[PDB]
Design a protein around this ligand. Structure first.
Ligand SMILES: Cc1cc2nc3c(=O)[nH]c(=O)nc-3n(C[C@H](O)[C@H](O)[C@H](O)COP(=O)(O)OP(=O)(O)OC[C@H]3O[C@@H](n4cnc5c(N)ncnc54)[C@H](O)[C@@H]3O)c2cc1C
Ligand SMILES: Cc1cc2nc3c(=O)[nH]c(=O)nc-3n(C[C@H](O)[C@H](O)[C@H](O)COP(=O)(O)OP(=O)(O)OC[C@H]3O[C@@H](n4cnc5c(N)ncnc54)[C@H](O)[C@@H]3O)c2cc1C
Ligand SMILES: O=c1[nH]cc(CCc2ccc(C(F)(F)F)cc2)[nH]c1=O
Ligand SMILES: O=c1[nH]cc(CCc2ccc(C(F)(F)F)cc2)[nH]c1=O
Lengths: 338, 338
């Protein structure tokens, strides 16, 4: 079986691993390739802080609820293991702050220890009169990409730097199965008008006294257009910007100041914090994830395609459940092939 | 008014500050000295992680409940201020773990967000079937000593390195008021058989993915003889040893291994963590704090003495309420002097 994963972000590498770990057998061996135009540390996944948390609204496909929970349970079963260091996996507690009342999320029993904030906790944040507290996980994005690549190489997967211009390009090289994990750029291989970039920009800051995440919310401007502070293992991510349809991969002054002046109004200790770096990235925003089979009639033959893209602001949050579902889809392909 | 504080740990420096900040006036100026045998970074206070948390039993003098709460409120009013960095003040959440059920502490409404752990949280710790979660404060001990010394120098307080052998030694130099803040060594100036060292030893570890405190409890062996993990601003303190009556200021192998093997059974990620340093210190264990006036008939005159010692494993936790009470006691001295 010749398999080609297009993509080397979280979705592509985890799907590569999950296909091998379930379907490379004594009876059927797989050749799994990974073709990518950019690899770690140069991907969207490497920009991300990596906090597990879905959207505040219930998801469009409600299988995404399951897939997110599956991913949390996978990571919670490993957080206290000594190799958690290598994945970049750790527990964090902290705050979700709202101006007004809001109902409980469709994930509150997935996280540990979920509660509303007391008035005394709310008194710590003058701008915010409602909110939650819970404990979740961070899975650091550069670390997990490093570790996944290691696991893949160990299992004989080969990596190749190339931009694929078409599915037919792979198919004439003899891909029996193409796994399409190309994120926000998937429209270049097949037109998808439902897929758009939600551009974000972030600051990494030196503030190691920060031990909680602090997410604020302005639902009028939607998810991600309100300040957030996220302690990572070495550095704190400061963020809170979303532009639908901006394709500029460039850090800018206005977005810097929006984040700086916003996060320093959240937590004034950040005014002292050394700025270490700044990054820009594109969330693959889609109404739902596309996690789907398609069969492609390109040239002298047909080829089977597993699509796995469109994971928005939640791709680390949902990756493992998506990779196992894409593995399920690969098993259907093998069943049809007999 | 000639005042001499004996001691330059948290209790002596904060009491020095509080006396000046309340009673050095236009009408009555004070000369406040600080005599100490050791200063920062070489004191008991500098060893301490600095987590705010009293004992699990209600305190012997129940004014110590008030004094501890006063100290929490003082520090919570400042934790989000940009100068919190300089004091070493920050919020931390985390776990108090018990083998069996235990009733709620006499401080649970002082901390923010106090709750029992859920079964799912308890499932994270196999050895521990009961426990609490809450948010508290750390006040880093070397940092606050640095900052206090700065405030004192700024206000004209002078520091002198000397071991005082007697209260009469100070009194013949013309101390009108002696403030005795000598911790576990107070017995050398006046016999106190109720004061004993509770020797501890600690490891500082590089584990910056640790964002919660994790305290375990074995009430049979008492407070402090069970593993604890405490994320500080740069390094995580690993500890959990108490010896009543050990005066050996020396780190040892057995106590190292007790802590290492204990904290790594709590949280196996620590097996990867780089050990940065190790320290030994003596808690000034007494049945209650001595926070009291005495008048001393030494030589050609009498002298007024404020005692402020015996703060056990809770001296950072209670310091501010004790310093203000010792200030109250100084006001009584000034009232008697007219
Ligand atoms: C600032 C920011 C912060 C975020 N924080 C979080 C968070 O805390 N938690 C969370 O759960 N999520 C977070 N996210 C979202 C998360 O980063 C994304 O959902 C996730 O990275 C998408 O992963 P992916 O593998 O689909 O895409 P990408 O990681 O962008 O990888 C796509 C891959 O496809 C390759 N590719 C594309 N087109 C081609 C082609 N034609 N030929 C060959 N290769 C191609 C690329 O080179 C690349 O290797 C954040 C996103 C941003 C922007
Ligand atoms: C390992 C460890 C961890 C701890 N962690 C915590 C924690 O997380 N939270 C918390 O609240 N507490 C904690 N504590 C307890 C806390 O450290 C003590 O209660 C506190 O330091 C006592 O402060 P002090 O000023 O009374 O004494 P010290 O800081 O020991 O200072 C005494 C001063 O007196 C001077 N002195 C003594 N005798 C003389 C003399 N004859 N002449 C002149 N100077 C003299 C000394 O030189 C010194 O300057 C911890 C203690 C230990 C040992
Ligand atoms: O793209 C992204 N994903 C995740 C994060 C982490 C913080 C966060 C999670 C969930 C929401 C919420 F509730 F609005 F959905 C807000 C903020 N940041 C990003 O830029
Ligand atoms: O001496 C000390 N003081 C404080 C600490 C911080 C952790 C701690 C607080 C309270 C208890 C309890 F609940 F048992 F009292 C146990 C552990 N460690 C020390 O060595």
């Amino acid at each position: 079986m010749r398999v080609v994963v297009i993509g080397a972000g979280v979705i592509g590498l985890s799907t590569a691993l999950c296909i091998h770990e379930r379907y490379h057998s004594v009876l059927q061996p797989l050749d799994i390739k990974v073709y990518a135009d950019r690899f770690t540390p140069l991907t969207t996944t490497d920009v991300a802080a990596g906090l597990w948390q879905p959207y505040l609204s219930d998801p469009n496909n409600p299988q995404e609820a399951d897939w997110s929970q599956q991913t949390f349970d996978y990571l919670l079963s490993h957080v206290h293991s000594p190799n958690a260091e290598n994945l970049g996996l750790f527990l964090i507690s902290g705050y979700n702050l709202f101006h007004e009342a809001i109902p409980d999320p469709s994930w509150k029993d997935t996280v540990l220890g979920f509660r509303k904030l007391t008035p005394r906790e709310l008194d710590m944040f003058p701008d915010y009169g409602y909110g939650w507290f819970h404990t979740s996980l961070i899975l650091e994005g550069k670390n997990y990409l490093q570790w996944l690549t290691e696991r893949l190489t160990e299992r004989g997967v080969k990596f190749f730097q190339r931009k694929v211009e078409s599915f037919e390009e792979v198919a004439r090289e003899g891909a029996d199965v193409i796994v399409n994990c190309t994120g926000v750029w998937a429209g270049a291989l097949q037109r998808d008008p439902l897929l758009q970039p939600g551009r974000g920009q972030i600051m990494k800051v030196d503030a190691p006294w920060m031990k909680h995440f602090i997410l604020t919310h302005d639902p009028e401007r939607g998810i991600y257009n309100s300040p957030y502070i996220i302690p990572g293992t070495q550095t704190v991510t400061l963020g809170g910007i979303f532009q639908l349809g901006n394709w500029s991969e460039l850090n800018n002054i206005q977005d810097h100041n929006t984040i700086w002046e916003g996060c320093c109004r959240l937590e004034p200790t950040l005014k002292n914090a050394r700025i270490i770096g700044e990054r820009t990235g594109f969330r693959p925003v889609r109404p739902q994830i596309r996690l789907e089979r398609e069969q492609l009639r390109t040239g002298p033959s047909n080829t089977e395609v597993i699509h796995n893209y469109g994971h928005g602001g939640y791709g680390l949050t949902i990756h493992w459940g998506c990779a196992l579902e894409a593995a399920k889809l690969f098993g259907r392909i093998l069943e049809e092939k007999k």
